Structures are given as structure tokens and as C-alpha cells.
């Protein structure tokens, strides 16, 4: 869903865990589905980390 | 409690939806939930039983996950899943039985079994799934202090009570006025009788009242009110008040007069039905008040006149009656009805495993005694045991 | 309710701790709390009153924050703080009075005033502060469905009842056996009398029993038991059971014999004391059964033997009494006691503003009736009004 994460370290860690074979299917699907939320009307942003 | 319910629910969904030939998309989310349950449970030891004759059993979890790839599930997949599901079902069964067989005076709402106390830990919260059953919904609502509600068909709200009251009496018991009643389950049958047929009463009318206070408030109750009590319409030989002797009762039934049924809450007349029979509704009430009268007929044909003399010998005794059934109702507290099997399940487990009489429930889970003294502690323990029993019934037939 | 309590608590802390000269390290955190309260309440409009004669008042909140750059706060700081404290205290006062003067048959725990409904919004939750008071503690506990406990100094648990039972009587009322009792607040005072002094009773012993059922389960109660009932030990002229006549009671007091005071919980005997007086402990009970006996003195000096003849005329009537006082106790539900003033505050507000009688509480908050019929809805509304009354008393006398 064209998601974003809060730091380059976070992105790299997510890539590593997504690729590794010992990850839970739930964790993999969550790393794939996790989304940020940018509310300009309220001047707020939430990012996964 | 919610964790135990969620284990039962995910196991039921696994035994139902995980079937041969089903699409992977039908069970993707269910398999996610199933693997969550397995991962959470693995590495834990549980101990169940040890009370009465319920055996002590130990449960150890090291199971493999389910890897769904086949486009349509095949026999191998179903067999592998059933291996895990059977063990988990046995575990849930034992946990539910061990929780049902226990009780406490203080903190009766909280888990009593050590297995359920352990399942209350924070780490098992990951299995919660969805709380859709009526009892679990009401459990959560009560825990948050929201107005709950249980819908009962023929609620067992009246403690069994078959009795009589003589307002006029004498040792001969040959000239009596009074009332007789049976309160049982969801039925009230009352009958006022007068041997003189109100010949000497003021206005040739005898008044009768029957007040029944319910141990809990019932709401949106559908009631059937019929104008005669069949249970007190035949000859009887009844023991005296003190059991010294017996007296003979030979009724002849007249229509009840000036019938008024009042459903009251906090001493206020919430509903009042005057001379109306059939199906009525009581929206909210904690006490029922039946009022009726025996009116001596002002005109009598010779056959009727022969029955009601003015001298002492009263071979036939005038009687009026009312029957009142609560076909359905709603109660905030847990009750026993004629449709649910939760009381039967709890009592059956206790009887089968010979659980010693505890400090809260009466011996044998006697419903009459329980409802006669339905204390708050008894209500808490009963709600807990009923909720876990309904959890158990999702997997045990 | 928690937000209302927190507004009152922060206002009390501000009015106690913001005094000229005090170091700012003594009020740093309090000023943070006060500024957050101001920020949250700012830009809000509330309306209070409009029930009975309670004035309709409007509250607009627009206040500047309190300063933070000061070592020892001075007269300017105190003045600027007190100007705001006065307005906030008045607002809390009116919100509490509005809450107290309202009741609801359904959801008596839910806020009734629209001001408190507003404060229930999640925006105001930031002002929660610390819920350290007993009543707010119990409010939170019962919201979570946890055990609640209120400690009372001689709780008002017995509904007022001054009455007498005549187990033996006749129209002349010159040969009477039975009991008199006064239950009131925390004192039971019972006295069994026999005009014949058990002359014709088996073993020359007359048995008296007195069962007092409480509406709520008391725990860890200290009870003073004394062997005489000073209230029923002087000559009386009592009107008959049906008010037709009056009968004379001329008592002479004997020691009660085979005294047994037992405290029962759902019919089971939790505590029992045999012929023991002074201070005793009832750990958990909801009924009190007092059994005692008039034993005709086996040996009598002539001045006593004259008093009790064999024939009918019984000038003096043997009487044996007990007095029981619950000095202190703990109850799950809310009650009125000697020390607290919550019942008084609620009744005072209702009387002062001429609040029409609602559906739940009896007229004038009659405690006798309120405790005689202590329904669940009444308990919910009473707990709500008592909690808000304590919140109010935290600021107003
Ligand atoms: Zn049916």
C-alpha cells in the first residue's frame, strides 16, 4: 500500500525480517500491510518504527 | 475468561472451516488465528483437576504450525490439523470442567482454577479473537459495568413453593377461607377459596391477594394470564398447617372477579392489567401482585342455589383462580431457563466428579435453594460457571 | 465522575498549597495539573440547573495559565490563582448539585446531569489526576467489577422498626407472652416477656427468638452485646396489634438465659457466641439470629416468690432482654453512618431546591424506606449521589 517507515534503520530491519525464513507469517503479512497516517488537516503524522 | 472463550472459538472454527476441499481463501485468516494460538501456547505447562474425583492431568504444548499452500485443502492437511485440534479440545474441556467445579465466597467472579488464572496472564491476550457469543458479550459488558441482558424462554425465576394460607379457619376445617398457590419455574398458579361462598361477607364479595416478589428484576417479559388454576380444581385432602390432622377440600370453580394483575418495581405500579386475559407484557418489574375476588352470584338457578346454603354444611367450596406464565423475559442476572443447558452441564460435571459441597452453592446445585437465596456472591459464581459452561458447550456435545 | 473528582481535587490542592511565600518546588507539579485543567476547560460552555428551583447557570471557560518562572510565589501569584479557583469551585459546586438532584431508574450509575455527560467525553480525560479518596476508589473498583469496601462507624443498616409479637394473647391482654423489639440504625434492642414467668412451660423455660435480616452483607464488624434491653424495662401502655384497645406492660427484668447470638450468611452459621457479652467480631454475615430464654428462677426469696403466683393475676411480667450495637463495620454497598454527612448533603440539596419526587428514591430521601427496599437501581443511584456529594464536600462545607 505504498507504505513508509520512520527511519532508514527501520526500513533495513524490516527488509531483513521480511526476507528471513524464520519469520512468522503473521509478522511478514504485517510488515507488508503496515501503513503510516498523514493527517494534514490536523497537522499530524504517525509512522511505524 | 476471554482467552478461554477464544481458544474454544478458534478450535470450533478450525473443526468447521478446515475441511477437505475448501479454498485457501476461506481459511487464510483462520489459519493466522490458529498459528497465533499455537505459537502463544507452545512452551507452557498446565495442570488441571485435583478436586474431588476429577483426575490431575498435565498438558504440554509443542505443536507445529499449519502451512497452507494447496489451492484446495486435501486429506493430509485435515488430518494434521485434527491432530492438534483434538489435543486442544481436550485441554479446553478439562480447563472448563476444572473451572466449573470451583467457587469462592470472595471475588467469586474471578477465575478459580489455576489453569484459568494462568491463562489470565498478559502473554495469552494475543489469542482473544472475537467475543460473539451471548454469554461472553454479557461477560465483557458486565466487566465494564454496562447494562447486560440475558434472554430466557420460561425463566426459572420463582423458587418452588406449594403452600396455602387460611385467613379463616377452625379445628373442624369445615368452613375455610383463604388461598392456595404453586410457584414453580416460570408459572404461578393461585386460587382463592371460600366455603361459605361469601354469603356473610360484606357486599357478597371476598377479596384475595397473592404477592410474589422476584429475586431479580425482569424486563420486556411476555406473560400469559389465564382465568383459572387447574391445579386447585379437584378434590384434595391436605395436611393441616402444623400437620396434626388433614382437611378435605372440594372445590367448585367460579370466574374470578375484579381481576387486577400489577407488576411493580420499587413499589411503583409499572404495569397494571384489569380483567384482561391472554398475552400481556410487563416491561420492567420486580414483584407481581395478583388480586381477585369471589363474588357470590346474584342470580342462581336451582341447581346452583342447592350448592350454596347459609347453614354450616358446605359440601362444595367456591373457588376462583389465576394462572400466570412467563413465556419469555430478559434479566440482567444469570438464570436457569427451559432452553439453555448450562445449569444441567454444571450440575452434571459436579455430580459426575463428586465435588464436595463448597462454601457458596447449595448441595447439588439445588436450583430452588440457589434462587431462594440468590446472593451477590452466588450470582457472581453462577455467572462465572455458566459462562465457562457455555464456552465448553461450543466443543463438547 | 473521575473527571469531576479530579477537578475538585486539583482545586482543593490549589487552594491549600498555593499560599504566598511557598517555594515553587512545592507546587511545580500541582501547577502543571492546574494549567492542564485550564487548557482543557478553556473554550467550553456548560449549563447547569433547571431542575426544581435550582437556578439555570451558564459557565464559559476562558482563563490564562498560571506562571512558572518564580522561586517563591508572591501575592500576585496567589491573587491570580484564587480568582480562577473561585470560579472553578463554583462550577464544580453547581455540577455536583445538578448531579445530586437527579435520578434514573435505568442506568443509575451513568451520569445524569448534562454537564457531567459532557465531562464524560474523552477530551476531558486528560484532567484525571489521582483518585485517592475512598468513594472514588470504590467507584473505580465497581466500574471494573472488583471488590468494594466502605468502612462505617455504626452503619445505618437496620430499617427503623418498633414492634411487638404476641405468641400468646387473649382479649383481656392480662396473660401475654412474646417479644418487643426496636431496630434502628446500628442498634437492635429486643426483649422477650412472659406474664406467667414460665410457670406452666416445660422445664420452666420459655424460648424467644429474634431474626434480623440485613439488606446487605456486612464484613469485619465489631459488635457490643449487652444482656439487658433498657428500652423495654419500664411500665408501658401499648396499643393493641389492631389498634382496638390498649394493654398494660409492667416488666420485671431477669437475666437472659442460654443466650446465643449467631451471625449467618445465606443461611449458614458463620459466627456464633454462646452466653458471651462485651465486644465480639462478626467476620461476614447478612442475618442476625438472637435466641434467649426466660428461665423461671429455681429458688426464690419470699420477696421474689410473691411476684410470680401460680394463679392468673400476674401483676409483674418477667422480661429478659438483649442489646446489640454494631459499632463499626465494612459493607460492599454504600450506606449512611454516624460520622459521614453524604446522606445529609444530598437530602439538604434536594430539600433546599424543592426537587420533585422522582421514580427511584422515596420522598424526602427517607432513609428508613430507602434501606427497607434497597433495590439494585436504588443502590446504583445512591452510590452515584453519595460519590458526587463526597466530591462536592471536598470543596464545600
Ligand atoms: Zn418451549
TrEMBL record, chain A:
<protein>
    <recommendedName>
        <fullName>Inner capsid protein VP2</fullName>
    </recommendedName>
</protein>
<comment type="similarity">
    <text>Belongs to the rotavirus VP2 family.</text>
</comment>
<feature type="site" description="Interaction with the intermediate capsid protein VP6">
    <location>
        <position position="30"/>
    </location>
</feature>
<feature type="site" description="Interaction with the intermediate capsid protein VP6">
    <location>
        <position position="26"/>
    </location>
</feature>
<feature type="site" description="Interaction with the intermediate capsid protein VP6">
    <location>
        <position position="34"/>
    </location>
</feature>
<comment type="subunit">
    <text>Homodecamer; each decamer is made up of two conformers of VP2, called VP2A and VP2B. Interacts with a VP1-VP3 complex. Interacts with the intermediate capsid protein VP6. Interacts with NSP5. Interacts (via N-terminus) with NSP2.</text>
</comment>
<comment type="function">
    <text>Inner capsid protein that self-assembles to form an icosahedral capsid with a T=2 symmetry, which consists of 120 copies of VP2, with channels at each of its five-fold vertices. This capsid constitutes the innermost concentric layer of the viral mature particle. It encapsidates the polymerase VP1, the capping enzyme VP3 and the genomic dsRNA, thereby defining the core.</text>
</comment>
TrEMBL record, chains B, C:
<dbReference type="GO" id="GO:0046789">
    <property type="term" value="F:host cell surface receptor binding"/>
</dbReference>
<dbReference type="GO" id="GO:0039626">
    <property type="term" value="C:viral intermediate capsid"/>
</dbReference>
<feature type="region of interest" description="Interaction with the inner capsid protein VP2">
    <location>
        <begin position="62"/>
        <end position="73"/>
    </location>
</feature>
<comment type="subunit">
    <text>Homotrimer. Interacts with the inner capsid protein VP2. Interacts with the outer capsid glycoprotein VP7. Interacts with the outer capsid protein VP5*.</text>
</comment>
<dbReference type="GO" id="GO:0005198">
    <property type="term" value="F:structural molecule activity"/>
</dbReference>
<dbReference type="InterPro" id="IPR008935">
    <property type="entry name" value="Virus_capsid_a-hlx_vir"/>
</dbReference>
<keyword id="KW-0106">Calcium</keyword>
<feature type="binding site">
    <location>
        <position position="153"/>
    </location>
    <ligand>
        <name>Zn(2+)</name>
    </ligand>
</feature>
<comment type="similarity">
    <text>Belongs to the rotavirus VP6 family.</text>
</comment>
<dbReference type="GO" id="GO:0019064">
    <property type="term" value="P:fusion of virus membrane with host plasma membrane"/>
</dbReference>
<dbReference type="GO" id="GO:0039621">
    <property type="term" value="C:T=13 icosahedral viral capsid"/>
</dbReference>
<dbReference type="GO" id="GO:0046872">
    <property type="term" value="F:metal ion binding"/>
</dbReference>
<dbReference type="InterPro" id="IPR001385">
    <property type="entry name" value="Rotavirus_A/C_VP6"/>
</dbReference>
<keyword id="KW-1154">Intermediate capsid protein</keyword>
<feature type="binding site">
    <location>
        <position position="266"/>
    </location>
    <ligand>
        <name>Ca(2+)</name>
    </ligand>
</feature>
<feature type="binding site">
    <location>
        <position position="286"/>
    </location>
    <ligand>
        <name>Ca(2+)</name>
    </ligand>
</feature>
<keyword id="KW-0167">Capsid protein</keyword>
<keyword id="KW-0832">Ubl conjugation</keyword>
<keyword id="KW-0862">Zinc</keyword>
<keyword id="KW-0946">Virion</keyword>
<keyword id="KW-0479">Metal-binding</keyword>
<dbReference type="InterPro" id="IPR008980">
    <property type="entry name" value="Capsid_hemagglutn"/>
</dbReference>
